[model samples]
Target chain A: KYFMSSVRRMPLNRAKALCSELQGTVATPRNAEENRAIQNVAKDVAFLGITDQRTENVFEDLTGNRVRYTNWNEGEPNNVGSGENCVVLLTNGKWNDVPCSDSFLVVCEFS
Target chain B: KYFMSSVRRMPLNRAKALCSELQGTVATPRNAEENRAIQNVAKDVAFLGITDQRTENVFEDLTGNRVRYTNWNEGEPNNVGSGENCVVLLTNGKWNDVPCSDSFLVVCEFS
Candidate 1:
């Protein structure tokens, strides 16, 4: 089995916030590419056809303190009334509002 | 050669907007991890120790039109007077403000 990871420039503070939410989510990324380049890598990792026992073990192994998820500022993640549901990395290393139809950089992973 | 890619949940409008900007840039991520997990994949790919000639050719081949880059909503990428220069993926699928000190899910790749 192989592990994958990627990084996008983000504000020091924001990075910490993301680490908080993804710490114990129901999904996990299986490979670096899948986890980094694609959205919902965690969900993908959960449904990779791995058995419950194997998956549980894998999750445990991968669940240590290796990855991070951050959150938005005080009023962030508010959806801003646009009915939007997306996240984006900015050139300035901060996360901000963005549309979902465009294609930006992506990371993919596979066993 | 292995090509890696990953996806982050984002808003539909923002995605389309990103596609318009990333059409052409100075750097590109080699694998899904470096591109998605790391902050400076394009810079990394450039300094991967590959000869400029090879790198240039690869860049041209890889350049054409396979990625996207989006901008803030009119006044976005503004840095908000905080000297912050970062981007983040929001749970709502819309990228928004975040601090730089947090941890988030990351994707990694290697040849």
Candidate 2:
């Protein structure tokens, strides 16, 4: 997989649309190695291709794949207020669940 | 106020300790202007001085000052699971309450 390194910040929907236009989707780091690879290029917090919009606490990747491997920051993915359905990759490389409307840098991935 | 722009990710306590050593403390943006200033230097998610450790929802700054001004993202500061007492400034310039143990970039401020 390849990560788009452009430093453009946008909402999840816009990010997904841009990635799709690029023949890809927001990144979904399946494991530590892939996660690290995305982290290397993302010096700032950025959006990931995971959400639990369909059901609370049941996150899925862009392709509707269950997110089996995750690197959530300690006590993260808390789904605070039951509204933070979208995921983000922090600069420290851990994951956080934030509101989908919040804008952040995008990390597009191509399979 | 001056912000330490060096990118160093650490726990909230460690970040506060470092700021104290520097004759400062973790950043406490009093308003939108100060918040934007911090955001300018912090290109990534970083720890802030505000937290609600003493109470469930009453957040305070490093100097024990009550945090009257905030820039929380929509539905944020939810105190998810009741364990996320520490605050972070996302790249999108919004605030999030995360676990104190979760590491993130530190932004120190000197008055």
Candidate 3:
């Protein structure tokens, strides 16, 4: 798999659309090593390919793969204000739940 | 090594004091895997052994180790209002810079 980090920020849907145009999806780190790899390139807050839009609190990747591993920050997925359903990668390498409408840098993953 | 996630919330200094009482320090995740491990048990916002008190944006873990790993949330460490010097772990596994006086859960580590 290959990873690409965006220099600009955009909303989740827009970021995903861009990734699709590139024949990829938002980056999804499956393990610690993968997470680090993404961070090495995207040293800022960036969007990932995971979301719980189908079911609150139940996240899945763009390919619809159920997330078996997670790196959520503490007190996260509090589903703050009942609108935080998308996932983002903090510059420090942890994940957080945020509203899909929020704009952020994006990381793209390609096979 | 062993890890313990607190069930109650406390200020950063207080949390560090408590960890000292237990012969431990607030949890310091050195890598993505360690970050995830700490989050797995502490499913709430928590205090971490990281801060940039000594130098703005220069975070360090307990034992005075320069923080070589971080998972800061997007726009984090913003030093909001010039008071966000302490680090906290959001429930979703992302790190945020906040005032040290803020109360929250804690994670401790011992060898």
Candidate with top lDDT is 2
Stronger candidate by DockQ (1 vs 2): 1
lDDT against the true structure, per candidate, is 0.29, 0.83, 0.82
**Model 1 lDDT per residue over B1-111, tens place:** 222212333322232222222121222334445334333322111111111123221212122442243322344434454433234433222233322332332222234
> Which candidate do you rate higher for DockQ, 1 or 3?
1
Candidate 2 segments whose C-alpha is farther than 4 A from its true place:
B1-111
Scanning candidate 1 chain A in windows of ten residues, the lowest lDDT window is: A43-52
Models 1 onward score TM values of 0.22, 0.49, 0.49
Q: Kindly list the per-residue Cα lDDT of model 3 for residues B1-111, writing each as its tens digit.
A: 456666667898888875664355789998999899888878778889998888888898866679888898888879988488889889889999989998988887766
Off by over 4 Å in 1: A1-111, B1-68, B71-75, B107-111
Better lDDT candidate (1, 2): 2
Docking class of 2: incorrect
Tens digit of per-residue lDDT, candidate 1, span A15-110: 223332222222233454433433432222111111112222121212343323432234444444433233443333223333233233322223
Docking level for model 1? incorrect
Chain A TM-score across all models, in listed order:
0.28, 0.95, 0.96
